[PDB]
mmCIF file of N, CA, C and O in Angstrom:
data_model
loop_
_atom_site.group_PDB
_atom_site.id
_atom_site.type_symbol
_atom_site.label_atom_id
_atom_site.label_comp_id
_atom_site.label_asym_id
_atom_site.label_seq_id
_atom_site.Cartn_x
_atom_site.Cartn_y
_atom_site.Cartn_z
ATOM 1 N N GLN B 878 -43.058 45.100 38.050
ATOM 2 C CA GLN B 878 -43.874 45.137 36.850
ATOM 3 C C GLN B 878 -43.779 43.819 36.111
ATOM 4 O O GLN B 878 -44.782 43.304 35.611
ATOM 5 N N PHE B 879 -42.583 43.237 36.078
ATOM 6 C CA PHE B 879 -42.427 41.938 35.446
ATOM 7 C C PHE B 879 -43.321 40.934 36.134
ATOM 8 O O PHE B 879 -44.051 40.180 35.488
ATOM 9 N N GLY B 880 -43.229 40.891 37.454
ATOM 10 C CA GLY B 880 -43.977 39.943 38.243
ATOM 11 C C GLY B 880 -45.451 40.035 37.959
ATOM 12 O O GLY B 880 -46.084 39.067 37.545
ATOM 13 N N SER B 881 -45.991 41.226 38.166
ATOM 14 C CA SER B 881 -47.402 41.460 37.911
ATOM 15 C C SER B 881 -47.779 41.060 36.502
ATOM 16 O O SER B 881 -48.797 40.394 36.274
ATOM 17 N N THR B 882 -46.939 41.431 35.548
ATOM 18 C CA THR B 882 -47.210 41.162 34.154
ATOM 19 C C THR B 882 -47.329 39.674 33.912
ATOM 20 O O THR B 882 -48.354 39.181 33.423
ATOM 21 N N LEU B 883 -46.266 38.950 34.237
ATOM 22 C CA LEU B 883 -46.245 37.523 33.996
ATOM 23 C C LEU B 883 -47.391 36.863 34.713
ATOM 24 O O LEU B 883 -48.040 35.977 34.165
ATOM 25 N N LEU B 884 -47.690 37.328 35.917
ATOM 26 C CA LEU B 884 -48.771 36.750 36.689
ATOM 27 C C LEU B 884 -50.066 36.847 35.916
ATOM 28 O O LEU B 884 -50.739 35.846 35.651
ATOM 29 N N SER B 885 -50.410 38.065 35.529
ATOM 30 C CA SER B 885 -51.655 38.294 34.824
ATOM 31 C C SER B 885 -51.724 37.452 33.565
ATOM 32 O O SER B 885 -52.701 36.729 33.332
ATOM 33 N N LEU B 886 -50.676 37.503 32.755
ATOM 34 C CA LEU B 886 -50.759 36.818 31.479
ATOM 35 C C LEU B 886 -50.780 35.314 31.642
ATOM 36 O O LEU B 886 -51.494 34.628 30.913
ATOM 37 N N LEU B 887 -50.028 34.784 32.602
ATOM 38 C CA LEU B 887 -50.029 33.348 32.811
ATOM 39 C C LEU B 887 -51.392 32.899 33.268
ATOM 40 O O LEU B 887 -51.875 31.842 32.863
ATOM 41 N N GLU B 888 -52.008 33.677 34.146
ATOM 42 C CA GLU B 888 -53.350 33.355 34.584
ATOM 43 C C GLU B 888 -54.304 33.381 33.408
ATOM 44 O O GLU B 888 -55.217 32.551 33.316
ATOM 45 N N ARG B 889 -54.063 34.292 32.470
ATOM 46 C CA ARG B 889 -54.827 34.297 31.234
ATOM 47 C C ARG B 889 -54.639 32.995 30.476
ATOM 48 O O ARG B 889 -55.612 32.362 30.052
ATOM 49 N N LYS B 890 -53.383 32.609 30.258
ATOM 50 C CA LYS B 890 -53.096 31.362 29.561
ATOM 51 C C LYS B 890 -53.811 30.208 30.232
ATOM 52 O O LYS B 890 -54.439 29.384 29.572
ATOM 53 N N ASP B 891 -53.690 30.128 31.553
ATOM 54 C CA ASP B 891 -54.317 29.063 32.323
ATOM 55 C C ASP B 891 -55.813 29.002 32.059
ATOM 56 O O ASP B 891 -56.345 27.959 31.675
ATOM 57 N N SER B 892 -56.513 30.106 32.316
ATOM 58 C CA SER B 892 -57.964 30.133 32.156
ATOM 59 C C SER B 892 -58.375 29.770 30.735
ATOM 60 O O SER B 892 -59.235 28.898 30.514
ATOM 61 N N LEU B 893 -57.786 30.457 29.755
ATOM 62 C CA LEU B 893 -58.131 30.193 28.368
ATOM 63 C C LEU B 893 -57.799 28.764 27.989
ATOM 64 O O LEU B 893 -58.516 28.152 27.202
ATOM 65 N N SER B 894 -56.714 28.217 28.529
ATOM 66 C CA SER B 894 -56.346 26.844 28.231
ATOM 67 C C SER B 894 -57.293 25.856 28.890
ATOM 68 O O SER B 894 -57.540 24.776 28.343
ATOM 69 N N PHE B 895 -57.869 26.227 30.032
ATOM 70 C CA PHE B 895 -58.891 25.393 30.648
ATOM 71 C C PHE B 895 -60.084 25.283 29.721
ATOM 72 O O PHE B 895 -60.473 24.186 29.294
ATOM 73 N N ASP B 896 -60.655 26.434 29.370
ATOM 74 C CA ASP B 896 -61.795 26.394 28.465
ATOM 75 C C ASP B 896 -61.400 25.842 27.109
ATOM 76 O O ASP B 896 -62.233 25.265 26.413
ATOM 77 N N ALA B 897 -60.138 26.005 26.722
ATOM 78 C CA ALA B 897 -59.651 25.471 25.461
ATOM 79 C C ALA B 897 -59.746 23.955 25.446
ATOM 80 O O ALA B 897 -60.334 23.368 24.535
ATOM 81 N N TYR B 898 -59.145 23.302 26.444
ATOM 82 C CA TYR B 898 -59.277 21.855 26.551
ATOM 83 C C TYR B 898 -60.742 21.468 26.559
ATOM 84 O O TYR B 898 -61.167 20.567 25.829
ATOM 85 N N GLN B 899 -61.537 22.171 27.365
ATOM 86 C CA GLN B 899 -62.949 21.834 27.473
ATOM 87 C C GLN B 899 -63.625 21.873 26.112
ATOM 88 O O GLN B 899 -64.217 20.887 25.666
ATOM 89 N N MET B 900 -63.479 22.988 25.408
ATOM 90 C CA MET B 900 -64.164 23.182 24.142
ATOM 91 C C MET B 900 -63.661 22.220 23.073
ATOM 92 O O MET B 900 -64.460 21.575 22.386
ATOM 93 N N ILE B 901 -62.344 22.087 22.927
ATOM 94 C CA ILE B 901 -61.808 21.259 21.854
ATOM 95 C C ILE B 901 -62.119 19.790 22.103
ATOM 96 O O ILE B 901 -62.577 19.075 21.207
ATOM 97 N N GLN B 902 -61.896 19.324 23.326
ATOM 98 C CA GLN B 902 -62.007 17.904 23.610
ATOM 99 C C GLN B 902 -63.458 17.467 23.749
ATOM 100 O O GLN B 902 -63.847 16.420 23.221
ATOM 101 N N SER B 903 -64.274 18.261 24.436
ATOM 102 C CA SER B 903 -65.684 17.926 24.573
ATOM 103 C C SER B 903 -66.475 18.120 23.288
ATOM 104 O O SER B 903 -67.585 17.590 23.179
ATOM 105 N N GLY B 904 -65.941 18.858 22.314
ATOM 106 C CA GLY B 904 -66.659 19.062 21.063
ATOM 107 C C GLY B 904 -67.012 17.787 20.321
ATOM 108 O O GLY B 904 -67.851 17.831 19.414
ATOM 109 N N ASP B 905 -66.416 16.656 20.699
ATOM 110 C CA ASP B 905 -66.721 15.367 20.092
ATOM 111 C C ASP B 905 -68.152 14.926 20.353
ATOM 112 O O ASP B 905 -68.584 13.891 19.822
ATOM 113 N N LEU B 906 -68.879 15.695 21.158
ATOM 114 C CA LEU B 906 -70.204 15.305 21.616
ATOM 115 C C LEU B 906 -71.179 15.061 20.470
ATOM 116 O O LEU B 906 -71.908 14.065 20.482
ATOM 117 N N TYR B 907 -71.229 15.952 19.477
ATOM 118 C CA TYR B 907 -72.247 15.776 18.443
ATOM 119 C C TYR B 907 -71.992 14.535 17.600
ATOM 120 O O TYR B 907 -72.919 13.758 17.330
ATOM 121 N N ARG B 908 -70.758 14.349 17.131
ATOM 122 C CA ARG B 908 -70.461 13.125 16.398
ATOM 123 C C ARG B 908 -70.807 11.912 17.253
ATOM 124 O O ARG B 908 -71.463 10.976 16.781
ATOM 125 N N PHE B 909 -70.347 11.898 18.511
ATOM 126 C CA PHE B 909 -70.659 10.771 19.387
ATOM 127 C C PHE B 909 -72.160 10.516 19.489
ATOM 128 O O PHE B 909 -72.596 9.360 19.480
ATOM 129 N N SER B 910 -72.966 11.573 19.579
ATOM 130 C CA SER B 910 -74.401 11.430 19.805
ATOM 131 C C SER B 910 -75.233 11.409 18.527
ATOM 132 O O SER B 910 -76.459 11.506 18.609
ATOM 133 N N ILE B 911 -74.598 11.329 17.357
ATOM 134 C CA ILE B 911 -75.346 11.279 16.098
ATOM 135 C C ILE B 911 -76.434 10.209 16.142
ATOM 136 O O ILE B 911 -77.561 10.415 15.665
ATOM 137 N N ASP B 912 -76.110 9.044 16.711
ATOM 138 C CA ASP B 912 -77.068 7.944 16.788
ATOM 139 C C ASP B 912 -78.397 8.380 17.385
ATOM 140 O O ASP B 912 -79.443 7.854 16.991
ATOM 141 N N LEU B 913 -78.371 9.365 18.290
ATOM 142 C CA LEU B 913 -79.567 9.866 18.962
ATOM 143 C C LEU B 913 -80.744 10.009 18.009
ATOM 144 O O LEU B 913 -81.847 9.525 18.282
ATOM 145 N N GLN B 914 -80.525 10.671 16.882
ATOM 146 C CA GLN B 914 -81.536 10.727 15.837
ATOM 147 C C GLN B 914 -81.322 9.643 14.788
ATOM 148 O O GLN B 914 -82.295 9.051 14.295
ATOM 149 N N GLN B 915 -80.054 9.373 14.443
ATOM 150 C CA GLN B 915 -79.726 8.496 13.323
ATOM 151 C C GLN B 915 -80.307 7.094 13.461
ATOM 152 O O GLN B 915 -80.433 6.387 12.456
ATOM 153 N N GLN B 916 -80.702 6.684 14.662
ATOM 154 C CA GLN B 916 -81.358 5.395 14.821
ATOM 155 C C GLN B 916 -82.805 5.492 15.271
ATOM 156 O O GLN B 916 -83.599 4.604 14.949
ATOM 157 N N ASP B 917 -83.174 6.542 16.006
ATOM 158 C CA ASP B 917 -84.580 6.713 16.349
ATOM 159 C C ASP B 917 -85.422 6.910 15.101
ATOM 160 O O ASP B 917 -86.612 6.565 15.085
ATOM 161 N N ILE B 918 -84.824 7.472 14.050
ATOM 162 C CA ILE B 918 -85.530 7.568 12.779
ATOM 163 C C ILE B 918 -85.933 6.182 12.290
ATOM 164 O O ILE B 918 -87.076 5.960 11.865
ATOM 165 N N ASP B 919 -85.026 5.214 12.406
ATOM 166 C CA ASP B 919 -85.348 3.851 12.013
ATOM 167 C C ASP B 919 -86.361 3.246 12.969
ATOM 168 O O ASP B 919 -87.218 2.456 12.558
ATOM 169 N N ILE B 920 -86.256 3.593 14.253
ATOM 170 C CA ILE B 920 -87.235 3.134 15.238
ATOM 171 C C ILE B 920 -88.644 3.499 14.790
ATOM 172 O O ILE B 920 -89.546 2.655 14.756
ATOM 173 N N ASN B 921 -88.850 4.765 14.433
ATOM 174 C CA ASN B 921 -90.177 5.185 13.992
ATOM 175 C C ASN B 921 -90.560 4.548 12.658
ATOM 176 O O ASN B 921 -91.718 4.161 12.464
ATOM 177 N N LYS B 922 -89.614 4.458 11.717
ATOM 178 C CA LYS B 922 -89.894 3.817 10.431
ATOM 179 C C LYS B 922 -90.416 2.391 10.608
ATOM 180 O O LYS B 922 -91.391 1.973 9.952
ATOM 181 N N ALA B 923 -89.798 1.646 11.526
ATOM 182 C CA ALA B 923 -90.154 0.249 11.726
ATOM 183 C C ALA B 923 -91.596 0.106 12.168
ATOM 184 O O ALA B 923 -92.216 -0.935 11.930
ATOM 185 N N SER B 924 -92.142 1.136 12.814
ATOM 186 C CA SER B 924 -93.507 1.046 13.308
ATOM 187 C C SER B 924 -94.471 0.766 12.165
ATOM 188 O O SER B 924 -95.094 -0.296 12.116
ATOM 189 N N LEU B 925 -94.554 1.683 11.198
ATOM 190 C CA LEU B 925 -95.449 1.475 10.064
ATOM 191 C C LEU B 925 -95.008 0.289 9.219
ATOM 192 O O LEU B 925 -95.857 -0.440 8.669
ATOM 193 N N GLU B 926 -93.694 0.044 9.152
ATOM 194 C CA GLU B 926 -93.225 -1.088 8.365
ATOM 195 C C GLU B 926 -93.828 -2.389 8.879
ATOM 196 O O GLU B 926 -94.367 -3.187 8.104
ATOM 197 N N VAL R 1024 -128.102 -31.593 6.195
ATOM 198 C CA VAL R 1024 -127.007 -31.633 7.162
ATOM 199 C C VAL R 1024 -125.619 -31.454 6.548
ATOM 200 O O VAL R 1024 -124.681 -31.093 7.274
ATOM 201 N N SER R 1025 -125.454 -31.696 5.242
ATOM 202 C CA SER R 1025 -124.108 -31.662 4.667
ATOM 203 C C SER R 1025 -123.428 -30.297 4.804
ATOM 204 O O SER R 1025 -122.195 -30.228 4.851
ATOM 205 N N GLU R 1026 -124.198 -29.208 4.894
ATOM 206 C CA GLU R 1026 -123.606 -27.876 5.023
ATOM 207 C C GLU R 1026 -123.038 -27.600 6.416
ATOM 208 O O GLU R 1026 -122.143 -26.752 6.556
ATOM 209 N N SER R 1027 -123.518 -28.309 7.438
ATOM 210 C CA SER R 1027 -123.056 -28.056 8.799
ATOM 211 C C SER R 1027 -121.550 -28.255 8.928
ATOM 212 O O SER R 1027 -120.878 -27.524 9.671
ATOM 213 N N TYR R 1028 -121.002 -29.231 8.203
ATOM 214 C CA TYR R 1028 -119.561 -29.451 8.221
ATOM 215 C C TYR R 1028 -118.806 -28.212 7.757
ATOM 216 O O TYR R 1028 -117.890 -27.738 8.439
ATOM 217 N N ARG R 1029 -119.155 -27.698 6.576
ATOM 218 C CA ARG R 1029 -118.497 -26.503 6.060
ATOM 219 C C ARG R 1029 -118.633 -25.338 7.030
ATOM 220 O O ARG R 1029 -117.672 -24.585 7.256
ATOM 221 N N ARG R 1030 -119.824 -25.175 7.611
ATOM 222 C CA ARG R 1030 -120.046 -24.070 8.538
ATOM 223 C C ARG R 1030 -119.108 -24.152 9.738
ATOM 224 O O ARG R 1030 -118.469 -23.161 10.107
ATOM 225 N N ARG R 1031 -119.022 -25.323 10.374
ATOM 226 C CA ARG R 1031 -118.116 -25.456 11.515
ATOM 227 C C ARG R 1031 -116.660 -25.298 11.093
ATOM 228 O O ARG R 1031 -115.856 -24.700 11.817
ATOM 229 N N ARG R 1032 -116.313 -25.812 9.914
ATOM 230 C CA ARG R 1032 -114.956 -25.701 9.386
ATOM 231 C C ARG R 1032 -114.495 -24.251 9.270
ATOM 232 O O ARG R 1032 -113.379 -23.906 9.689
ATOM 233 N N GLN R 1033 -115.344 -23.389 8.697
ATOM 234 C CA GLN R 1033 -114.867 -22.084 8.238
ATOM 235 C C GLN R 1033 -114.448 -21.143 9.368
ATOM 236 O O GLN R 1033 -113.509 -20.359 9.185
ATOM 237 N N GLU R 1034 -115.083 -21.210 10.541
ATOM 238 C CA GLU R 1034 -114.660 -20.322 11.624
ATOM 239 C C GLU R 1034 -113.277 -20.704 12.132
ATOM 240 O O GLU R 1034 -112.448 -19.833 12.423
ATOM 241 N N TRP R 1035 -112.992 -22.002 12.181
ATOM 242 C CA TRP R 1035 -111.681 -22.466 12.610
ATOM 243 C C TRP R 1035 -110.626 -22.087 11.585
ATOM 244 O O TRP R 1035 -109.527 -21.637 11.938
ATOM 245 N N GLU R 1036 -110.947 -22.291 10.307
ATOM 246 C CA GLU R 1036 -110.040 -21.926 9.224
ATOM 247 C C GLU R 1036 -109.691 -20.438 9.265
ATOM 248 O O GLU R 1036 -108.510 -20.051 9.213
ATOM 249 N N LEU R 1037 -110.710 -19.582 9.395
ATOM 250 C CA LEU R 1037 -110.442 -18.154 9.484
ATOM 251 C C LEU R 1037 -109.691 -17.788 10.754
ATOM 252 O O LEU R 1037 -108.854 -16.886 10.723
ATOM 253 N N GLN R 1038 -109.935 -18.478 11.867
ATOM 254 C CA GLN R 1038 -109.165 -18.166 13.065
ATOM 255 C C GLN R 1038 -107.696 -18.533 12.898
ATOM 256 O O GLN R 1038 -106.811 -17.838 13.413
ATOM 257 N N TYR R 1039 -107.416 -19.618 12.176
ATOM 258 C CA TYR R 1039 -106.027 -19.939 11.862
ATOM 259 C C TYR R 1039 -105.394 -18.844 11.012
ATOM 260 O O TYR R 1039 -104.237 -18.458 11.232
ATOM 261 N N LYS R 1040 -106.141 -18.329 10.035
ATOM 262 C CA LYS R 1040 -105.627 -17.209 9.246
ATOM 263 C C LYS R 1040 -105.374 -15.988 10.134
ATOM 264 O O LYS R 1040 -104.396 -15.239 9.939
ATOM 265 N N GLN R 1041 -106.262 -15.768 11.106
ATOM 266 C CA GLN R 1041 -106.070 -14.697 12.074
ATOM 267 C C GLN R 1041 -104.747 -14.861 12.794
ATOM 268 O O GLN R 1041 -103.970 -13.908 12.916
ATOM 269 N N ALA R 1042 -104.493 -16.068 13.302
ATOM 270 C CA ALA R 1042 -103.234 -16.345 13.986
ATOM 271 C C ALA R 1042 -102.046 -16.076 13.071
ATOM 272 O O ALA R 1042 -101.000 -15.589 13.519
ATOM 273 N N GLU R 1043 -102.197 -16.380 11.780
ATOM 274 C CA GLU R 1043 -101.128 -16.106 10.823
ATOM 275 C C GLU R 1043 -100.778 -14.625 10.790
ATOM 276 O O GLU R 1043 -99.614 -14.236 10.979
ATOM 277 N N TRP R 1044 -101.772 -13.770 10.576
ATOM 278 C CA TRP R 1044 -101.397 -12.359 10.539
ATOM 279 C C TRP R 1044 -100.962 -11.849 11.915
ATOM 280 O O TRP R 1044 -100.094 -10.976 11.993
ATOM 281 N N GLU R 1045 -101.518 -12.381 13.004
ATOM 282 C CA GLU R 1045 -101.100 -11.935 14.335
ATOM 283 C C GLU R 1045 -99.618 -12.222 14.588
ATOM 284 O O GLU R 1045 -98.879 -11.366 15.115
ATOM 285 N N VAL R 1046 -99.162 -13.425 14.220
ATOM 286 C CA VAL R 1046 -97.749 -13.734 14.396
ATOM 287 C C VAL R 1046 -96.926 -12.857 13.480
ATOM 288 O O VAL R 1046 -95.809 -12.461 13.832
ATOM 289 N N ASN R 1047 -97.444 -12.545 12.290
ATOM 290 C CA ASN R 1047 -96.725 -11.599 11.449
ATOM 291 C C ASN R 1047 -96.550 -10.276 12.181
ATOM 292 O O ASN R 1047 -95.482 -9.655 12.130
ATOM 293 N N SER R 1048 -97.594 -9.857 12.893
ATOM 294 C CA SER R 1048 -97.612 -8.553 13.549
ATOM 295 C C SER R 1048 -96.556 -8.438 14.638
ATOM 296 O O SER R 1048 -95.788 -7.470 14.675
ATOM 297 N N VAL R 1049 -96.497 -9.424 15.534
ATOM 298 C CA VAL R 1049 -95.717 -9.252 16.763
ATOM 299 C C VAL R 1049 -94.212 -9.045 16.563
ATOM 300 O O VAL R 1049 -93.532 -8.625 17.504
ATOM 301 N N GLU R 1050 -93.676 -9.322 15.371
ATOM 302 C CA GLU R 1050 -92.268 -9.054 15.051
ATOM 303 C C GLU R 1050 -91.829 -7.625 15.386
ATOM 304 O O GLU R 1050 -90.643 -7.370 15.689
ATOM 305 N N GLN R 1051 -92.766 -6.683 15.265
ATOM 306 C CA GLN R 1051 -92.532 -5.281 15.582
ATOM 307 C C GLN R 1051 -91.865 -5.082 16.936
ATOM 308 O O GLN R 1051 -90.895 -4.327 17.054
ATOM 309 N N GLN R 1052 -92.362 -5.761 17.969
ATOM 310 C CA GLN R 1052 -91.817 -5.546 19.301
ATOM 311 C C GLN R 1052 -90.387 -6.046 19.389
ATOM 312 O O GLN R 1052 -89.532 -5.406 20.017
ATOM 313 N N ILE R 1053 -90.096 -7.148 18.700
ATOM 314 C CA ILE R 1053 -88.761 -7.725 18.760
ATOM 315 C C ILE R 1053 -87.754 -6.739 18.188
ATOM 316 O O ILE R 1053 -86.750 -6.407 18.830
ATOM 317 N N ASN R 1054 -88.029 -6.217 16.991
ATOM 318 C CA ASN R 1054 -87.043 -5.316 16.399
ATOM 319 C C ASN R 1054 -87.014 -3.965 17.108
ATOM 320 O O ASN R 1054 -85.938 -3.366 17.271
ATOM 321 N N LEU R 1055 -88.180 -3.470 17.540
ATOM 322 C CA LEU R 1055 -88.232 -2.219 18.287
ATOM 323 C C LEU R 1055 -87.304 -2.283 19.486
ATOM 324 O O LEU R 1055 -86.457 -1.403 19.688
ATOM 325 N N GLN R 1056 -87.443 -3.336 20.291
ATOM 326 C CA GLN R 1056 -86.608 -3.433 21.475
ATOM 327 C C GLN R 1056 -85.163 -3.728 21.116
ATOM 328 O O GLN R 1056 -84.269 -3.283 21.829
ATOM 329 N N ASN R 1057 -84.897 -4.486 20.050
ATOM 330 C CA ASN R 1057 -83.504 -4.669 19.650
ATOM 331 C C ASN R 1057 -82.826 -3.316 19.467
ATOM 332 O O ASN R 1057 -81.748 -3.052 20.027
ATOM 333 N N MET R 1058 -83.497 -2.420 18.739
ATOM 334 C CA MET R 1058 -82.976 -1.070 18.549
ATOM 335 C C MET R 1058 -82.838 -0.350 19.882
ATOM 336 O O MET R 1058 -81.804 0.269 20.167
ATOM 337 N N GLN R 1059 -83.901 -0.377 20.686
ATOM 338 C CA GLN R 1059 -83.889 0.274 21.990
ATOM 339 C C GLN R 1059 -82.673 -0.149 22.807
ATOM 340 O O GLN R 1059 -81.926 0.694 23.312
ATOM 341 N N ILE R 1060 -82.476 -1.460 22.961
ATOM 342 C CA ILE R 1060 -81.407 -1.973 23.813
ATOM 343 C C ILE R 1060 -80.049 -1.560 23.277
ATOM 344 O O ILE R 1060 -79.184 -1.097 24.028
ATOM 345 N N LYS R 1061 -79.834 -1.710 21.971
ATOM 346 C CA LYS R 1061 -78.507 -1.391 21.459
ATOM 347 C C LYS R 1061 -78.206 0.100 21.579
ATOM 348 O O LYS R 1061 -77.106 0.490 22.001
ATOM 349 N N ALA R 1062 -79.184 0.948 21.258
ATOM 350 C CA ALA R 1062 -78.990 2.387 21.386
ATOM 351 C C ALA R 1062 -78.749 2.791 22.834
ATOM 352 O O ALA R 1062 -77.853 3.591 23.124
ATOM 353 N N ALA R 1063 -79.553 2.266 23.759
ATOM 354 C CA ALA R 1063 -79.374 2.609 25.163
ATOM 355 C C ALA R 1063 -78.011 2.160 25.659
ATOM 356 O O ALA R 1063 -77.352 2.874 26.425
ATOM 357 N N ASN R 1064 -77.571 0.977 25.227
ATOM 358 C CA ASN R 1064 -76.245 0.500 25.589
ATOM 359 C C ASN R 1064 -75.187 1.485 25.123
ATOM 360 O O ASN R 1064 -74.277 1.846 25.879
ATOM 361 N N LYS R 1065 -75.295 1.935 23.874
ATOM 362 C CA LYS R 1065 -74.367 2.948 23.384
ATOM 363 C C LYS R 1065 -74.469 4.248 24.180
ATOM 364 O O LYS R 1065 -73.466 4.949 24.348
ATOM 365 N N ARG R 1066 -75.660 4.582 24.686
ATOM 366 C CA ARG R 1066 -75.832 5.847 25.400
ATOM 367 C C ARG R 1066 -74.918 5.959 26.613
ATOM 368 O O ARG R 1066 -74.568 7.072 27.022
ATOM 369 N N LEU R 1067 -74.512 4.828 27.194
ATOM 370 C CA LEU R 1067 -73.585 4.851 28.322
ATOM 371 C C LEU R 1067 -72.242 5.464 27.954
ATOM 372 O O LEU R 1067 -71.475 5.853 28.848
ATOM 373 N N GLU R 1068 -71.927 5.505 26.661
ATOM 374 C CA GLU R 1068 -70.712 6.159 26.199
ATOM 375 C C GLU R 1068 -70.622 7.593 26.695
ATOM 376 O O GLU R 1068 -69.581 8.019 27.201
ATOM 377 N N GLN R 1069 -71.712 8.352 26.566
ATOM 378 C CA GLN R 1069 -71.682 9.746 26.996
ATOM 379 C C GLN R 1069 -71.292 9.870 28.461
ATOM 380 O O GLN R 1069 -70.407 10.659 28.810
ATOM 381 N N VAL R 1070 -71.793 8.968 29.295
ATOM 382 C CA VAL R 1070 -71.540 9.064 30.726
ATOM 383 C C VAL R 1070 -70.106 8.669 31.033
ATOM 384 O O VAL R 1070 -69.372 9.402 31.708
ATOM 385 N N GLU R 1071 -69.703 7.482 30.580
ATOM 386 C CA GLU R 1071 -68.382 6.973 30.932
ATOM 387 C C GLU R 1071 -67.283 7.853 30.349
ATOM 388 O O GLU R 1071 -66.281 8.140 31.021
ATOM 389 N N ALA R 1072 -67.462 8.313 29.111
ATOM 390 C CA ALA R 1072 -66.491 9.214 28.518
ATOM 391 C C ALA R 1072 -66.442 10.519 29.287
ATOM 392 O O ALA R 1072 -65.358 11.050 29.543
#
């Protein structure tokens, strides 16, 4: 029972920690990509300017 | 005949004025592409990261 138990829960930790790293670390995407709009707005402004 | 001078003068004078506003105009492409190049260069961040 110990074996099975630890196995299941550790596998839980592993899986959740995989998605955990993914979600926490990759979440930087929006800040990183702010320029996507933050400068294309100026691109369009410059046209009429 | 004295008016012929003014007549020939004025088309050249106005064409020079045309060139003036045309050179004013073309600045758009320079700044547009400056933005394009710098933003696209930054876009490589998403890939390399």
